[PDB]
Design a binder for these strands. Structure first.
Ligand code: MG
Ligand code: MG
Ligand code: MG
Ligand code: MG
Ligand code: MG
Ligand code: MG
Ligand code: MG
Ligand code: MG
Ligand code: MG
Ligand code: MG
Ligand code: MG
Ligand code: MG
Ligand code: MG
Ligand code: MG
Ligand code: MG
Ligand code: MG
Ligand code: MG
Ligand code: MG
Ligand code: MG
Ligand code: MG
Ligand code: MG
Ligand code: MG
Ligand code: MG
Ligand code: MG
Ligand code: MG
Ligand code: MG
Ligand code: MG
Ligand code: MG
Ligand code: MG
Ligand code: MG
Ligand code: MG
Ligand code: MG
Ligand code: MG
Ligand code: MG
Ligand code: MG
Ligand code: MG
Ligand code: MG
Ligand code: MG
Ligand code: MG
Ligand code: MG
Ligand code: MG
Ligand code: MG
Ligand code: MG
Ligand code: MG
Ligand code: MG
Ligand code: MG
Ligand code: MG
Ligand code: MG
Ligand code: MG
Ligand code: MG
Ligand code: MG
Ligand code: MG
Ligand code: MG
Ligand code: MG
Ligand code: MG
Ligand code: MG
Ligand code: MG
Ligand code: MG
Ligand code: MG
Ligand code: MG
Ligand code: MG
Ligand code: MG
Ligand code: MG
Ligand code: MG
Ligand code: MG
Ligand code: MG
Ligand code: MG
Ligand code: MG
Ligand code: MG
Ligand code: MG
Ligand code: MG
Ligand code: MG
Ligand code: MG
Ligand code: MG
Ligand code: MG
Ligand code: MG
Ligand code: MG
Ligand code: MG
Ligand code: MG
Ligand code: MG
Ligand code: MG
Ligand code: MG
Ligand code: MG
Ligand code: MG
Ligand code: MG
Ligand code: MG
Ligand code: MG
Ligand code: MG
Ligand code: MG
Ligand code: MG
Ligand code: MG
Ligand code: MG
Ligand code: MG
Ligand code: MG
Ligand code: MG
Ligand code: MG
Ligand code: MG
Ligand code: MG
Ligand code: MG
Ligand code: MG
Ligand code: MG
Ligand code: MG
Ligand code: MG
Ligand code: MG
Ligand code: MG
Ligand code: MG
Ligand code: MG
Ligand code: MG
Ligand code: MG
Ligand code: MG
Ligand code: MG
Ligand code: MG
Lengths: 117, 122, 52, 204, 137
RNA sequence: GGUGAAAAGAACCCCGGGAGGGGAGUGAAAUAGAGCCUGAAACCGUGGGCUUACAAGCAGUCACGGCCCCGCAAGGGGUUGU
RNA sequence: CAGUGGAGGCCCGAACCGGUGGGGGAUGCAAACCCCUCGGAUGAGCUGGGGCUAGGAGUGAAAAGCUAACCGAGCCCGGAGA
RNA sequence: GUGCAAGAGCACUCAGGCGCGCGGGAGAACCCUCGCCAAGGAACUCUGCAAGUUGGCCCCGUAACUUCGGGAGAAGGGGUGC
RNA sequence: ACCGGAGCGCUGUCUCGGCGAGGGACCCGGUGAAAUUGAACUGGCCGUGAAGAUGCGGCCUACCCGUGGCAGGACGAAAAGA
RNA sequence: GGGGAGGUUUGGCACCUCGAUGUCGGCUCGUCGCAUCCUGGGGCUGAAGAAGGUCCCAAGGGUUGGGCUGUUCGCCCAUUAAAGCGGCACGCGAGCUGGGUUCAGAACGUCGUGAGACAGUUCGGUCUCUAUCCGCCACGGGCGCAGGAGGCUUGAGGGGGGCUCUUCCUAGUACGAGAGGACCGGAAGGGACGCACCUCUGGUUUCCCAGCUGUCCCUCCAGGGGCAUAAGCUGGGUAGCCAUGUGCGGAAGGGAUAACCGCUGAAAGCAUCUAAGCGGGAAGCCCGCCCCAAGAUGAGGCCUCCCACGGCGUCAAGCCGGUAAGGACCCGGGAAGACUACCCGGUGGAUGGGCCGGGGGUGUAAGCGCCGCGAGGCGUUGAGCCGACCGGUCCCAAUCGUCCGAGGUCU
């Protein structure tokens, strides 16, 4: 209802955003991250924009991406190592595949987020 | 949309300064009255020795409203206050020389008098 | 403990009946390309990994 | 008894002589008649127009043996338009001259489990003075020992909208035979991209 | 069909292209086709544009002036067969898209708030009086 | 409150992290295996027989009929369609 | 008159004391709570510790209020199987 | 600690300490706590209940009445940043 | 923070509702209550009956089982009517 | 003076209910009756016309907003077509309310020596999260429908809707001394209500964009983050959802009738609408329009697609298997949605996510340069950022696969 819109959320906004943010910091720091499918299917398109944003170079975009990740060094790494690999590729900088094991005694389904390669 | 407890600015010189609506004289229960609609009102304040006294129950006609009027031509008009001109029971304006704009709607409703005196029909 | 309450002990019958839609259905498994292993489709499943 | 299938494409307004007109645009692609229903074989008379162009692949059905049985490039949908038998092999906007009045059928947007307030424009409680847990409630639903039951049809909340809605008698404005468009008086059910069917009214 | 919107846009030939760009927060005189008794004058209307409301076709705008000590706003369809021609008549430093805020200031403070867009003025009197000569020879 | 005559209180192997079990073993008996004699009823379950998705109900009773079961048959038992 | 002075069951307002209005809670977080609001806040003030007063009795700025979560006469055991 | 006229107030924050011992999804009605709303502006209603408006400091200014202290923060205004 | 009447300001109190946020409700995994309960195979109407019927009569209707919802009945629960 | 109907008043009786059937008024939601307030149809009129009066027929729909009182009721204001009356436990407190009344506090009048008392007043005064069955709203699972399957449908039976005013032409004509002022037929514009809808207008739009305060941080400046809600505040806002906004609806028409008006016509030479027979005649009845609908077990119809036996039962019903058409799973999703269901897509693919373009919002980013002691200003610049919409593009993900599904009984 009125869902006639688009894009999900559990947690509240101050929190929801912080979530995405941290989930990226991790993904960029760890290249691979396990997390619940929804949590993931969402975080997916968040990094893409930050990857594609690093595919550019101007400090505007550095500073821009600096907004969501707060760690200079990790953005350094974002622009210096991570972005290159993704030239000539347009979108899809990221993958998620669902794992077959559920979390225990909360029975959450899981899945995999991956810096695509 | 003018309605029952609403105050209207008085647009003529009948010596009334404000009437509040009292009843709108569309059908047997119209929810609101707009430009070119005649309502019953009560004079809530009235210039010293006018024709009309505070407390006089009167007929008047909505010449300007604060809620925009749509025109079939697809445009709209809105004024910074609500205003009416007190008119006769037979429907002629009780004052003379009304002032401040007015809606063309007034014309098509049979109120030429007022629009004639109107210093600018918008 | 209050306002609305059950008017009669529901019966073994009536009870078990409501229960009729309770039974679960078994998982959906499929063999993988890799092992003879069994997977929920569209998953990955350990001891088998994956390509690409 | 004209009729053609279409899709609510969208709406805007356009200017006639010298006033704005709220119009909704139906695209009513050339509907291939696909069967006809006689008073003899069927017992009633009408005509089965198809609509969207279909992949001969997904038509793997026994559906092929219908389109085939009338040599019609497979469509996506096809509804009958009762009591109206045309000619040629397809019906097109051309059945409609501007100024003809039509009834468009559509499928109302779906509001899901609806409040009695939204479903019936019910009053509901007072935002203020009294209680606070009946704000949007229907309130009383009955009497006492007699009847001692609720009437069928009682307005109550629940799944509302997303249903067959016919809005009678809109005016056809300029029909664009070119791009297959059909212009109307706006008030036509369902969302954009929905199947709809237009017909001659009942004015006289 | 995947056109969807392109088809709405086709529905538009009613597009007019003669009227000039005008930013909100600067005065315009719009000459409007008016039905008087049963004739057609062209009532003018000259105020600050308060709100352009983009939607391509059926984008619209409003202008607000004080007719006889009373304020007035008029809403205009930007492509109305009823606008004769819209005479621009002053360019202003808006600093903000929708600017109804001016409603409760209405006076001189408006003036101190809506300076003249010197930039865009320079643009016009330039490439206008400057394209006058390119027409001649 | 109550294993058993006696602790003979179940070595040892097997599945399990354990619990608990399956074998092996003791005992006259282990559904006497350790809050363990006997072990009723409510109550929960597994298997089987008859039965039930156009039907109206203090749930039974009377009749006929079908099915299943015990008996060679005459008979009886279970079920329940009308 | 000005200065100085720094009174007050004085004013505004936290702590602290309290419970005005509304909402919430009503098998509650809670056998009296929560939120917003509100009253006092140098006084007839609030408060720790040590003491004394009790059942037709005490205590009571007085409501028959309080006297160990129900007080127009406490709780317990007894007369009592009134 | 910093800021706000002041402060044990308020916002953020050291030190220190916590995320309140069920989670995961979805994004219906309805309930709770909260935000905003065209025109109107008490017509609501037992009652403006509730919400809202107002709000600190600085200057201007301030009525009946009075027990001469009051009424007074009357009212109504203007200023406030860099 | 007494109770009544009036006005100004302001407002979702109302005309007359709409959208949005979150905590529940809903769905999946863990844990898992309660009052109540003659037994139940528990429909509508008009009768009737201890004078207000799912349970008598007559007629009408009605495939089996649930889930989210609403409160008209079960003279619903509660308390051996104040 | 007389006879009745009703069961809305005041009562009488004391029959169920004192191991409890919560009371007045309001709100919310109504639904029935007709003894009709309006609108429709008519008879008489002391009916010229217009307006009325009285009676008949007719529930289809409608039946306003305020002032005062807890009030119902009533008076009053302003309207209206009209502001109908009753039933439903004086309908409705496991729906709200709690102003009224009948707990404890307090006071006045009053009675009583008194304690206290008073259908006398007056101020205060705890209204209980969880629905088992029936009923109701909505939504599924099962099986059924004598072959299986895909699609399209008939409409038995239900349901929704049903109001009404004003001005104009007819015509200032009929009627009337005048004042007044029609039938009939036609047009236009409204009120309220209903269903859809977002183009417009107007809302919201919780992070789409901007600005601003305090503070704490990154990194000193710049620049930026957290927090000040569960958005810190403010200005503004797409899609979606919406009304204040937009469209449409009430019919027309056919049929049968009510009161009533008649044609012909006896009985009863005439007379009569009637007893045989026939015509007209209502906003009402049946149709018609809209929606549901074959569990219509009385399970309908059409078009189409798939099709014998491979082994036991001696005729007979079956039983077990791999299959057919076809279907299901699982997945990507959806103006579809509580769940389920529904619908689309699943690499032969644009379904979602990105990326791109557009639409749209904000309103000139940063950095650098330039002017100014400075706060700032100006240029680069309609820049920068940029959800949802209209598209595009296989970059990512819908991988791969599994299961089920007839072999069609008898005259
Ligand atoms: Mg989407
Ligand atoms: Mg003039
Ligand atoms: Mg003039
Ligand atoms: Mg002049
Ligand atoms: Mg059982
Ligand atoms: Mg398909
Ligand atoms: Mg309301
Ligand atoms: Mg309450
Ligand atoms: Mg409650
Ligand atoms: Mg009944
Ligand atoms: Mg726009
Ligand atoms: Mg031992
Ligand atoms: Mg062992
Ligand atoms: Mg050994
Ligand atoms: Mg361990
Ligand atoms: Mg052990
Ligand atoms: Mg033995
Ligand atoms: Mg034994
Ligand atoms: Mg043991
Ligand atoms: Mg034991
Ligand atoms: Mg036993
Ligand atoms: Mg057997
Ligand atoms: Mg049967
Ligand atoms: Mg047997
Ligand atoms: Mg002092
Ligand atoms: Mg003091
Ligand atoms: Mg004080
Ligand atoms: Mg203290
Ligand atoms: Mg106290
Ligand atoms: Mg109190
Ligand atoms: Mg409660
Ligand atoms: Mg002391
Ligand atoms: Mg005592
Ligand atoms: Mg005791
Ligand atoms: Mg004795
Ligand atoms: Mg906890
Ligand atoms: Mg605002
Ligand atoms: Mg408002
Ligand atoms: Mg406003
Ligand atoms: Mg406003
Ligand atoms: Mg009102
Ligand atoms: Mg009152
Ligand atoms: Mg208040
Ligand atoms: Mg304020
Ligand atoms: Mg005062
Ligand atoms: Mg400062
Ligand atoms: Mg008793
Ligand atoms: Mg009475
Ligand atoms: Mg007796
Ligand atoms: Mg009882
Ligand atoms: Mg009871
Ligand atoms: Mg009761
Ligand atoms: Mg009572
Ligand atoms: Mg008459
Ligand atoms: Mg007459
Ligand atoms: Mg007459
Ligand atoms: Mg009659
Ligand atoms: Mg009658
Ligand atoms: Mg009726
Ligand atoms: Mg009625
Ligand atoms: Mg009705
Ligand atoms: Mg009142
Ligand atoms: Mg009275
Ligand atoms: Mg009634
Ligand atoms: Mg009652
Ligand atoms: Mg009740
Ligand atoms: Mg009540
Ligand atoms: Mg009371
Ligand atoms: Mg109260
Ligand atoms: Mg009172
Ligand atoms: Mg009292
Ligand atoms: Mg009392
Ligand atoms: Mg008495
Ligand atoms: Mg009182
Ligand atoms: Mg009080
Ligand atoms: Mg109550
Ligand atoms: Mg209360
Ligand atoms: Mg609750
Ligand atoms: Mg009806
Ligand atoms: Mg009709
Ligand atoms: Mg004339
Ligand atoms: Mg005359
Ligand atoms: Mg809009
Ligand atoms: Mg706005
Ligand atoms: Mg929007
Ligand atoms: Mg932002
Ligand atoms: Mg800095
Ligand atoms: Mg800089
Ligand atoms: Mg931080
Ligand atoms: Mg922090
Ligand atoms: Mg904002
Ligand atoms: Mg509306
Ligand atoms: Mg004769
Ligand atoms: Mg005759
Ligand atoms: Mg039947
Ligand atoms: Mg074959
Ligand atoms: Mg063969
Ligand atoms: Mg195959
Ligand atoms: Mg196949
Ligand atoms: Mg499928
Ligand atoms: Mg395929
Ligand atoms: Mg391809
Ligand atoms: Mg795409
Ligand atoms: Mg610039
Ligand atoms: Mg600049
Ligand atoms: Mg810049
Ligand atoms: Mg440089
Ligand atoms: Mg831009
Ligand atoms: Mg860009
Ligand atoms: Mg490509
Ligand atoms: Mg392609
Ligand atoms: Mg099989």
């Amino acid at each position: 209802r009125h869902l006639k819109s688009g894009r999900k959320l559990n947690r509240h906004s101050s929190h929801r955003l912080a979530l995405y943010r941290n989930q990226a910091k991790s993904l960029l720091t760890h290249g691979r991250i396990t997390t619940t499918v929804p949590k993931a299917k969402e975080l997916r398109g968040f990094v893409d924009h930050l990857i594609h944003l690093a595919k550019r170079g101007d400090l505007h975009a550095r500073r821009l991406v600096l907004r969501d990740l707060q760690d200079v060094k990790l953005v350094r790494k974002l622009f210096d190592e991570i972005a290159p690999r993704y030239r000539d590729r347009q979108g899809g900088y990221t993958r998620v595949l669902k794992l077959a094991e559920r979390r225990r005694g909360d029975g959450a389904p899981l899945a995999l987020v991956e810096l695509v390669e | 949309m003018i309605q029952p407890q609403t105050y209207l600015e008085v647009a003529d010189n009948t010596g009334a300064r404000k009437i509040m609506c009292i009843r709108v004289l569309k059908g047997s229960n119209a929810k609101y009255a707009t430009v070119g609609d005649v309502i019953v009102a009560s004079v809530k304040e009235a210039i010293p020795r006018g024709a009309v006294k505070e407390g006089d129950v009167v007929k008047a006609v909505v010449v300007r409203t604060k809620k925009e009027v749509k025109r079939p031509d697809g445009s709209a008009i809105r004024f910074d206050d609500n205003a009416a001109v007190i008119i006769n029971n037979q429907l002629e304006p009780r004052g003379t020389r009304v002032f401040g704009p007015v809606a063309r709607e007034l014309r098509e409703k049979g109120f030429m008098k007022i629009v004639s005196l109107a210093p600018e029909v918008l | 403990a209050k306002h609305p309450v059950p008017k009669k002990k529901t019966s073994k019958a009536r009870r078990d009946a409501r229960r009729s839609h309770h039974a679960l259905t078994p998982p959906i498994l499929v063999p993988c390309p890799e092992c003879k292993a069994m997977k929920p489709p569209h998953t990955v499943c350990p001891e088998c990994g994956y390509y690409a | 008894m004209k009729g053609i299938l279409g899709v609510k494409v969208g709406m805007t307004r356009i200017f006639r002589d010298d006033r704005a007109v709220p119009v909704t645009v139906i695209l009513a692609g050339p509907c291939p008649v696909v069967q006809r229903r006689t008073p003899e074989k069927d017992g009633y008379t009408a005509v089965q127009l198809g609509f969207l162009p279909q992949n001969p692949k997904r038509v793997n059905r026994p559906l092929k043996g219908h389109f085939a049985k009338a040599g019609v490039e497979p469509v996506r949908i096809l509804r009958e338009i009762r009591d109206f038998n045309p000619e040629g092999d397809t019906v097109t906007v051309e059945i409609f001259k501007p100024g003809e009045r039509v009834d468009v059928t559509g499928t109302s947007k779906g509001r899901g489990f609806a409040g009695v307030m939204k479903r019936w424009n019910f009053a509901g409680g007072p935002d203020s003075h009294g209680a606070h847990k009946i704000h949007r409630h229907p309130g009383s639903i009955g009497n006492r020992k007699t009847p001692g039951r609720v009437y069928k049809g009682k307005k109550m909340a629940g799944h509302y909208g997303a249903e067959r809605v016919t809005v009678m008698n809109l005016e056809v404005v300029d029909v664009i035979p070119e791009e297959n468009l059909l212009l109307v008086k706006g008030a036509v059910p369902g969302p954009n991209g929905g199947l709809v069917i237009v017909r001659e009214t009942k004015k006289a | 069909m995947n056109r969807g919107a392109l088809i709405k846009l086709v529905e538009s030939r009613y597009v007019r292209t003669d009227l000039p760009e005008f930013r909100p927060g600067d005065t315009v005189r719009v000459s409007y086709k008016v039905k008087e008794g049963n004739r057609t004058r062209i009532q003018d209307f000259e105020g600050i544009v308060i709100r352009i409301r983009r939607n391509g076709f059926n984008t619209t705008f409003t202008v607000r002036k004080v007719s006889y000590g009373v304020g007035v706003e008029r809403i205009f369809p930007l492509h109305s067969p009823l606008i004769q021609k819209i005479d621009i008549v002053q360019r202003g430093r808006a600093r903000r898209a929708k600017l109804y805020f001016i409603r409760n200031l209405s006076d001189r403070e408006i003036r101190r708030k809506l300076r003249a867009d010197r930039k865009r003025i320079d643009k016009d009197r330039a490439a206008e009086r400057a394209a006058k000569e390119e027409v001649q020879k």
